[PDB]
Amino acid sequence: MKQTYMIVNELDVNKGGMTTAMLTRSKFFLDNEISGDIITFDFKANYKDILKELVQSKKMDKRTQMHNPFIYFKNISNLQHKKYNYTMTRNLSNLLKDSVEIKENSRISRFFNIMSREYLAYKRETEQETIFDLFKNNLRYKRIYFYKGKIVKTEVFNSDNNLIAEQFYDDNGYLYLYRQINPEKKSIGKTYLVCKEKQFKNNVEFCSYFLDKLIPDINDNIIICDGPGSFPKILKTNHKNVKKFAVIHVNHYKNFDDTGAVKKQEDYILRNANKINGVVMLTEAQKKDIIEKYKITNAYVISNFINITDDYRDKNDNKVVGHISRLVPQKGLPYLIDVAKKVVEQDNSVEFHLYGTGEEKSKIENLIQESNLTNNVKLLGYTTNAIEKIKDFRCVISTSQFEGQGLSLIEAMLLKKPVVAFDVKYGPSDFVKDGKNGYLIENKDIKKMANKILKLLHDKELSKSLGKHGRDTIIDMYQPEKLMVKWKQLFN
Ligand SMILES: O=c1ccn([C@@H]2O[C@H](COP(=O)(O)OP(=O)(O)O[C@H]3O[C@H](CO)[C@@H](O)[C@H](O)[C@H]3O)[C@@H](O)[C@H]2O)c(=O)[nH]1
Ligand SMILES: [Cl-]
Ligand SMILES: [Cl-]
Ligand SMILES: [Cl-]
């Protein structure tokens, strides 16, 4: 009878620990007769394809539904008409009627009005989608998106080519939602729902109204806010009976800031703890630090659910050091390159395999090239198949400067790999047993990390022994039954 709604701004196929944690939690809840649905707030025309890939890749349970305002309001708008209305496409065809089409590239064409002596449009055509950029006085004023043969969205641009408005279209070709965009700030302003003839001040109010419509106001319905950016949307609903929880997935302290300052999003959640049923943390240490500053009484520790990988045959014969993460400053990748430089100096056979995507790619590439590590350190992009890549790693490392819990470290340990990790707040000190399943290193100590990496690369038997203890440690600490009991207590 308990229904859960796990809230994050968006879902995609190239995401990190938070999305993994949520999808795993949904699967375990569903095995315990508790519905675990995801709610997102962003527009993706291809959301069907993302969800299919997440299910077929075994990341997402087939029973885990995703609710989303664009999907919900489109399905309602679709009921209002029987036949497709071609007014928009006719308006475009009429605009370009006089215009001659000239191919610029393989996919790009331009429309020139011979009469007016002016270029009115650019068109880019792909397999599934066609984009039109419309121009007046050599300035773009609108973009039209065709997907699967129909207009799904239009965008309006000012004279600075900044987005000032977005319009969304139903499966019958009708406008059902439009919003103003602040051109410089790129923030969402007034939002208009065409069906209800209803106006909202901003995206928070619109998304809070969506939650009011989607979730019945009963105590057997639970909102779990995972995305810290989404917390204002769950706080500002008119629900009086629904249970509301916030999960803190990461160190709340300002990144690379020793002042004791706390991040704005996490500070907002923690200051408003009294307005919700509970704040869930992943470690006792994080709960302790939060209780000290915020004097919260509804704080709870529940570890992330973990997917126990199946025991496998280790065909290990390669000295590869593995690292799988979002390429973000949090992960201390410059410290990793420093460790790699020392390890490569004493063993040229050592490869460092870095899997993931992010802003830091160009910086790390420069560091690899600068230290002549192009042979030894390789950025291999995002993998939907992390398990297979880990199986061929000798050891996995973390240079991370902060965590909520090391899910990539846990994943490696479950696949019987030894781990070497900087001892950072709300991170690996819970599950890394220094000398038994891997090594806990003083933060930013390059030499100590490098030495233990070399010790493991030079001693396969020790590596295998530490690895088996790691798998056993994770199975013992993060038994799904214990976590299910903790969640069920919160729900009652
Ligand atoms: O190419 C890649 C790169 C990453 N991942 C996955 O991304 C996740 C990484 O999670 P984690 O190591 O925990 O890092 P974050 O993405 O930073 O996770 C955040 O959210 C998690 C959920 O609570 C917390 O455990 C972390 O501490 C917190 O930083 C893992 O499941 C990886 O398998 C891939 O699948 N492929
Ligand atoms: Cl094509
Ligand atoms: Cl203007
Ligand atoms: Cl602005």
Residue numbers in the entry: 1 to 492
List sentences quoted exactly from the publication behind this structure.
The backbone amide and carbonyl groups of Thr383 form two hydrogen bonds with the O2 and N3 atoms of the base, providing specificity for uridine, and the aromatic ring system of the base is stacked against the Tyr382 side chain. The tandem backbone amide groups of Leu407 and Ser408 contact the α-phosphate of UDP-glucose and another main-chain amide group from Gly17 interacts with β-phosphate. In addition, the side chains of Arg326 and Lys331, each form two salt bridges with the β-phosphate. The glucose moiety contacts TarM(Se)G117R through multiple interactions. The side chains of Asn304 and His249 are hydrogen-bonded to the C6 hydroxyl group, the backbone amide group of Gly406 interacts with C4 hydroxyl, and the Glu403 side chain and backbone amide groups of Gly404 and Gln405 contact with the C3 hydroxyl group. The side chain of Gln330 is hydrogen-bonded to the C2 hydroxyl. The related enzyme TarM(Sa), which accepts UDP-GlcNAc as donor substrate, has a threonine at this position. Thus, the longer Gln330 side chain appears to allow TarM(Se) to distinguish UDP-glucose from UDP-activated bulkier sugars, such as UDP-GalNAc and UDP-GlcNAc. The binding site for UDP-glucose in TarM(Se) is composed of eight amino acids, seven of which are identical to that for UDP-GlcNAc in TarM(Sa). The only difference is Gln330 in TarM(Se) and Thr330 in TarM(Sa), which clearly suggests a key role for this residue in allowing TarM(Se) to discriminate against the use of UDP-GlcNAc as a donor substrate.
